[PDB]
């Protein structure tokens, strides 16, 4: 056996990789259900196990020579993924951990490096002079995610503002220098070394359980630390695929379904 | 009434006092803690994490993503250094905004060993070697490999192990070096040179990035708290 | 009392306003400029702070409008460096000197406009 | 007993085990002592990390507010002032706390009051008593300097007399959660498809609550002098019994509002040549 | 981007009327710097409420003010014929600009 | 009802204790017991599932 070869299985789903580089359990803590001395709600929790805790694959994003980065938010990227998204919308409170698997495959002649960072409470900076004015529909883009930018272009549409983020890439979208983002739970997909990265995320929050529709516990940021080069080609595009499984999903406060405006 | 004498320093406020004080909200029912992942007991656990160095602070490269990547190539002038850096981790502008430099800019004094880990981001067919060298102060800063190999150095072989760590040992005359710029407690010079060169086959990129990382070893401590230069506020 | 300049009537060209006050109120308090086209309602144009010569302008006017100060006469000025027919308005000069109880950010005092000057019309047409 | 590990003696090596090579793609960082790449002597290491502990790091009190109040007879005058209790409008304590995502601490608040006469001719005034009243969220705020709310039947209050030692109190961990959240990737409200208009569900990004930890109200208790006395209550905030819970990169570009937004000076790094030492 | 107000409001003398002012979450829903201004014809405006529920000296107690969310309201209770005129709402807005309402003409019937 | 503990002596003259008493009912009122010694940094330094040993190859 070698830690380049990993098999990950959750529910009815299985990921096999042959070019891993170990795996990160974030802050040393594997995900767990709520212990009885840490519990806040009195309602009996729904714990669906294999129905929700399975590998869901988001939309593939194409890494090219002018790509500046991509970001997602959890649980928001899984809000339309099957019974997890249905249990998240039908309940007021929800907790889950996550296994985040990023796949990015390239030849021995390609080069490049992606930093995959998992950020607890990944706030992003807005687009405009008005403080904290990013709307819900733009702060929560779903499985599409969002992109980083090379510069802070500022919204001047006074008639109707865009109310989006403007995440600047070396500023990690939130005003901190990107070289210090390695204090977060992280892996590098360096194409001569590994084709995949695995970060296992516990439920990092100031509460035992929280509103999943209102609040994102983790943000996943993927940024090219070294740019993609191949041969002497300007047109290079290789796929990045992000696959997230919830772990230890539990939900409280059943009611009618949340139907957010987007 | 007990006879008492008021010593000097009565009725002062020190801002560093460690004295008891009455409670504005007595008998408050404090919310109990829970086992949140990621607890930090000491700021040196925010050091000993390798964080990436903005090594490339040239005029077009700085304040972009290109500040982190040093261009190695198959056709560089091999006598000349890849990078040069001063071991002043709170003052050198390549080191000052790393997590080690940001922890150290809240402190006046520092002491310990420093890891420098360099990661190679060429293709798998890219091969080569690299001399990375630390020279203690009091001499000419190394301009050639012939000078730099007299110092503490690691010859790094590019292979399946993608990255290599060079440790700067704690060679110092003082027990603690100053974090500000000071020729008395200066820390020496880090230099990097080719030994052989980058060799690539055909249909392979001829230039490639290298990323550098810095962190504290287990022997590292800082000892006098101060305000930082890195944040400011207008009137 | 806060004293305005007289009325202007020219199209296409630049128009400069003048506004003079007492020496204490000039040095202590900010001066705000507000306009009112006929029947259309009040419209904040910007602020000059002669204690420190910082200015803020509304985004409708950020290119067009400059404000300057004179410590010798305790006068502030406003120049509308290009002009249109919709700028036919009564232009008010107002001192922000009624203090709010709420601390602005955490270090400053907010002031509402209370000492309004009589102001002046400018009409922009051939 | 707080001492660091001693550097062990290390001789020359010629070995199949190689400490210097690693893979930072794993996310781990290489745990090397200097003994694992250079020859080292033994040295008994008496240094320690005492000043770098989290309580030692936050032990210094920092200014969070400058509250201004007037005392003058009515003829324009701020006879009382009110401040929403926040750390985020002074940059230094904010940047120190924002190294971490969550934290849990008791507080000390220390109040330094300085007064001055405002015009030179008008002369003297007697010594002033200052009421600093805590108004928790939902409690009634004053609308004058002497209405019924200052009777302080259930509110905490400090009566400071001028010239005394700077008044101080301790406050417990008052957060509704198990730790204070310095950062909040979320909203207070979600807009729904069934909402009558968008402003029912509209709320600020990264805002948990408005009036999160209440309001301090400040007045001079004295009847007004004919001379105008202007006074400033400076508030110094010291976290203590601190536990911090998820490390973050510190703030690089200047702060803009209470969120993570940025507007100006997006150049935190200077110019230095790659070969220049 | 201006604060929304009804264009006109009417009532007979002795009644109570309420002029209202709805802005966005970055002005009235966040700041307490919400003020009201009265403008009789030809006059410069007079500040009648400065902070929410706070009147200046010499403004009669029939004027009163409140805030309910993103909305602020001015209630004139015991309406008189001298109250006829324009009323302009005002707030601070979080990019350090200041914004007036579109204004309400009050006709005393 | 006092507490007593040893100081870490820096300078020496020519093992020394200090005494504290908590005077107030609540824990918030208390002084800072400056004894919050460091942990293992491995939860940030090496957060792996298959934990490496430092002299072995990392892959
Ligand atoms: C008599 C005065 C009593 C003082 C009462 C203080 C009320 C508790 C304040 C705790 C503030 C916690 C820090 C977070 C502030 C923020 O969110 O910016």
What was the structure determination method?
cryo-EM
Size of interface D-F (CB pairs under 8 A): 70
Q: Which residues of F touch A25 (CB under 8 A)?
A: 47-49
Q: Which residues of F touch B46 (CB under 8 A)?
A: 44
- Residue keyed to tokens 């981001």: B121
CA distance E4 to E10: 18
Contact yes or no for F45 and B49 at CB 8 A: yes
CA-nearest residue, atom 7 of ligand 1: D213
Interfacial A residues in 120-159 facing B (CB < 8 Å): 120, 150
CB under 8 Å to B170, separation ≥6 — which residues?
B111, B112, B113, B219, D34
Helix (H) / strand (E) element for A83: namely helix A82-90
Q: Is C85 exposed, middle or buried (0-12, 13-18, 19+ CB in 10 A)?
A: exposed
CB under 8 Å to B48, separation ≥6 — which residues?
B215, B216, B217, B218, B220, D29, F41, F44, F45
Q: Which residues of D touch E29 (CB under 8 A)?
A: 210
CA distance D253 to A171: 8
Nearest to C46 by CA among A168, A29, E108, E96: E96
Provide the resolution (angstroms): 2.7
CA distance D30 to B160: 16
Residues spanned by the domain of C57 = 3-122
Tokens of B27: 């008998």
Q: Are C21 and C3 in contact (CB under 8 A)?
A: yes
CA-nearest residue, atom 15 of ligand 1: D86
The count of domains in chain C is: 1
* CATH number given to A6-254: 2.60.120.20
How close, in Å, is residue E32 to chain A by CA atoms? 16
**Domain ranges across chain E:** 8-108
Q: Which chains touch D (3 or more CB pairs under 8 A)?
A: A, B, C, E, F
Q: Is the CB of B160 under 6 A from ligand 1?
A: no
How close, in Å, is residue A205 to chain D by CA atoms? 8
Q: Is the CB of D80 under 6 A from ligand 1?
A: no
Q: Is the CB of D132 under 6 A from ligand 1?
A: yes
Q: Three-state DSSP class for D137?
A: coil
CA distance D237 to A156: 38
Q: Are D235 and D64 in contact (CB under 8 A)?
A: yes
- What's the helix, strand, coil split of chain D in %, to 5? 10, 30, 60
Taken in order of first residue, the domains within chain B and their CATH numbers are 1-235 (2.60.120.20)
Tokens of E1: 């981007």
Render the burial of A68-87: b for 16+ CB within 10 Å, e for the rest.
Answer: bbbbbbbbbbbbebeebbbb
Contact yes or no for F59 and A21 at CB 8 A: yes
Question: Which superfamily does CATH assign the domain made up of E8-108 to?
Answer: Immunoglobulins (2.60.40.10)
CA distance B222 to B225: 8
Q: Is B149 exposed, middle or buried (0-12, 13-18, 19+ CB in 10 A)?
A: middle
CB under 8 Å to A57, separation ≥6 — which residues?
A241, A242, A243
Q: Which residues of D touch E3 (CB under 8 A)?
A: none
Q: Which residues of A touch E95 (CB under 8 A)?
A: 128-131
Q: Are D132 and D232 in contact (CB under 8 A)?
A: no
* Angle formed at CA D184 by CA A44 and CA B65, multiple of 5 degrees: 130
The listed CATH number (2.90.10.10, 2.60.120.20, 3.10.580.10, 3.40.640.10) that belongs to domain D24-247? 2.60.120.20
Question: Taking the mean position of all CA atoms in its chain, how far away is CA A231?
Answer: 31
User: Backbone phi, then psi, for B102, in 5-degree steps?
Assistant: -75, -35
Contact yes or no for E1 and A130 at CB 8 A: no
CB under 8 Å to C77, separation ≥6 — which residues?
C16, C17, C18, C19, C67, C68, C69, C70
Compare all CA atoms of chain D with the CA of C98 and give the residue at the minimum distance: D76
Q: Are A78 and A56 in contact (CB under 8 A)?
A: yes
CB under 8 Å to F17, separation ≥6 — which residues?
F4, F5, F6, F7
How close, in Å, is residue A208 to chain E by CA atoms? 29
Q: Is A20 exposed, middle or buried (0-12, 13-18, 19+ CB in 10 A)?
A: buried
Compare all CA atoms of chain E with the CA of C110 and give the residue at the minimum distance: E33
Q: Which chains touch B (3 or more CB pairs under 8 A)?
A: A, D, F
CB under 8 Å to E60, separation ≥6 — which residues?
none
Compare all CA atoms of chain E with the CA of A129 and give the residue at the minimum distance: E95
CA-nearest residue, atom 11 of ligand 1: D213
């Amino acid at each position: 056996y070698s830690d380049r070869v990993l098999q990950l299985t959750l529910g009815n789903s299985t990921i096999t990789t042959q070019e891993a580089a170990n795996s990160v359990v974030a802050y040393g803590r594997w995900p767990e259900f709520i212990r009885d001395d840490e519990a806040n709600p009195v309602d009996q929790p729904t714990e669906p196990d294999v129905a929700t805790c399975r590998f869901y694959t988001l939309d593939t994003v194409m890494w090219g020579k002018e790509s500046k980065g991509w970001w997602w938010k959890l649980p928001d990227a899984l809000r339309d993924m099957g019974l997890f998204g249905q249990n998240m919308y039908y309940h007021y409170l929800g907790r889950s951990g996550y296994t985040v698997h990023v796949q990015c495959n390239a030849s021995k002649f390609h080069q490049g490096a992606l930093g995959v960072f998992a950020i607890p409470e990944y706030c992003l900076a807005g687009d405009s002079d008005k403080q904290r004015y990013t709307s819900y529909a733009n702060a929560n883009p779903g499985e599409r995610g969002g992109k980083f930018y090379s510069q802070f272009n500022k919204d001047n549409a006074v008639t109707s503002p865009k109310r989006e983020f403007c995440p600047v890439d070396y500023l990690l979208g939130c005003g901190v220098l990107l070289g210090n983002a390695f204090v977060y739970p992280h892996q590098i997909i360096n194409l001569r070394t590994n084709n995949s990265a695995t970060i296992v995320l516990p439920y990092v929050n100031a509460l035992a359980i929280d509103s999943m529709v209102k609040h994102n516990n983790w943000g996943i940021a993927i940024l090219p630390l070294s740019p993609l080069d191949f041969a002497q080609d300007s047109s290079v595009e290789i796929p990045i695929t992000v696959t997230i499984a919830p772990m230890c999903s539990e939900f409280n406060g059943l009611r009618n379904v949340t139907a957010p405006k987007f | 009434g007990l006879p008492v004498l008021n010593t000097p320093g009565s009725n002062q406020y020190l801002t560093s006092d460690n004295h008891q004080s009455p409670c504005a909200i007595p008998e408050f029912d404090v919310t109990p803690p829970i086992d949140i992942p990621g607890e930090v007991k000491n700021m040196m656990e925010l050091a000993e994490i390798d964080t990436m160095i903005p090594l490339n602070l040239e005029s077009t490269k700085r304040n972009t993503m290109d500040m982190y990547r040093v261009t190695l190539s198959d056709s560089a002038d091999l006598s000349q250094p890849i990078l040069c850096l001063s071991l002043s981790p709170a003052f050198d502008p390549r080191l000052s905004h790393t997590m080690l430099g940001e922890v150290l800019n809240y402190y006046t004094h520092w002491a310990g060993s420093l890891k420098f880990t360099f990661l190679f981001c060429g293709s798998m067919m890219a091969t080569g070697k690299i001399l990375v060298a630390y020279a203690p102060p009091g001499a000419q800063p190394p301009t050639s490999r012939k000078e730099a190999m007299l110092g503490t150095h690691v010859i790094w072989d590019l292979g399946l192990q993608s990255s290599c760590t060079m440790v700067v040992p704690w060679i110092s005359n003082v027990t603690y070096r100053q974090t500000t710029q000071d020729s008395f407690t200066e820390g020496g010079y880090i230099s990097m040179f080719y030994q052989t060169r980058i060799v690539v086959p055909l249909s392979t990129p001829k230039s490639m990035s290298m990323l550098g990382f810095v962190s504290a070893c287990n022997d590292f401590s800082v000892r006098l708290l101060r305000d930082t230069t890195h944040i400011s506020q207008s009137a | 009392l806060v004293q305005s300049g007289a009325e202007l009537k020219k199209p296409g060209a630049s128009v400069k306003f003048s506004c003079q006050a007492s020496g204490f109120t000039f040095t202590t308090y900010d001066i705000h400029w507000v306009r009112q086209a006929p029947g259309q309602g009040l419209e904040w144009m910007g602020m000059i702070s002669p204690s420190r010569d910082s200015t803020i302008y509304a985004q409708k006017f950020q290119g067009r409008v400059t404000m300057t100060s004179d410590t010798s006469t305790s006068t502030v000025y406003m120049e509308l460096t290009s002009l249109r027919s919709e700028d036919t308005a009564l232009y008010y000069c107002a001192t922000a000197s009624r203090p709010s109880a709420w601390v602005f950010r955490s270090l400053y005092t907010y002031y509402y406009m209370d000492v309004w000057g009589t102001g002046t019309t400018v009409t922009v047409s051939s | 007993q707080d001492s660091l590990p001693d550097t062990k003696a290390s001789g020359p090596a010629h070995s199949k085990e190689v400490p210097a090579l690693t893979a930072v793609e794993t996310g781990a960082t290489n745990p090397l002592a200097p003994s694992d790449t250079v020859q080292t002597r033994h040295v008994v290491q008496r240094r320690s990390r005492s000043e770098s502990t989290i309580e030692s790091f936050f032990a210094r009190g920092a200014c969070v507010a400058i509250i201004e109040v007037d005392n003058e007879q009515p003829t324009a005058q701020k006879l009382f002032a009110m401040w929403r209790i926040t750390y985020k409008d002074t940059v230094q304590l904010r940047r120190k706390l924002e190294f971490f995502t969550y934290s849990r601490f008791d507080m000390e608040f220390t109040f330094v009051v300085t007064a001055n006469f405002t015009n030179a001719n008008n002369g003297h005034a007697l010594n002033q008593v200052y009421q600093i009243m805590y108004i928790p969220p939902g409690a009634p705020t004053p609308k004058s300097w002497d209405d019924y709310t200052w009777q302080t039947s259930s509110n905490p209050s400090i009566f400071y007399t001028y010239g005394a030692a700077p008044a101080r109190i301790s406050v417990p961990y008052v957060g509704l959660a198990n730790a204070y959240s310095h950062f909040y990737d979320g909203f207070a409200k979600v807009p729904l498809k069934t909402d009558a208009n968008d402003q029912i569900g509209d709320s600020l990004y990264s805002a948990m609550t408005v009036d999160d930890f209440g309001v301090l109200a400040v007045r001079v208790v004295n009847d007004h002098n004919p001379t105008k006395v202007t006074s400033k209550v400076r508030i110094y905030m010291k976290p203590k019994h601190v536990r911090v819970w998820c490390p973050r990169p510190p703030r690089a570009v200047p702060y803009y509002g209470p969120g993570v937004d940025y507007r100006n000076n997006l150049d935190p790094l200077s110019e230095k040549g790659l070969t220049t030492y | 981007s201006a604060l929304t107000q009804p264009a006109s409001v009417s009532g007979s003398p002795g009644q109570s009327i309420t002029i209202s002012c709805t802005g966005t979450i970055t002005d009235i829903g966040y700041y307490n710097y919400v003020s009201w201004y009265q403008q009789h014809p030809g006059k410069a405006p007079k500040l009648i409420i400065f902070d929410v529920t706070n009147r200046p000296s010499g403004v009669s107690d029939r004027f009163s003010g409140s805030k309910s969310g993103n909305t602020a309201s001015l209630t004139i209770s015991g309406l008189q014929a001298e109250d006829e005129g324009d009323y302009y709402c005002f707030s601070h807005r979080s990019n350090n600009i200041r914004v007036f309402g579109g204004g309400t003409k009050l006709t005393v019937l | 009802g006092a507490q007593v503990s040893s100081q870490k002596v820096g300078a020496h003259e020519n093992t020394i204790n200090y005494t504290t008493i908590n005077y107030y009912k609540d824990s918030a009122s208390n002084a800072a017991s400056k004894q919050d010694y460091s942990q293992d940094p491995s939860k940030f330094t090496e957060p792996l599932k298959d934990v490496l040993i430092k002299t072995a190859p990392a892959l």
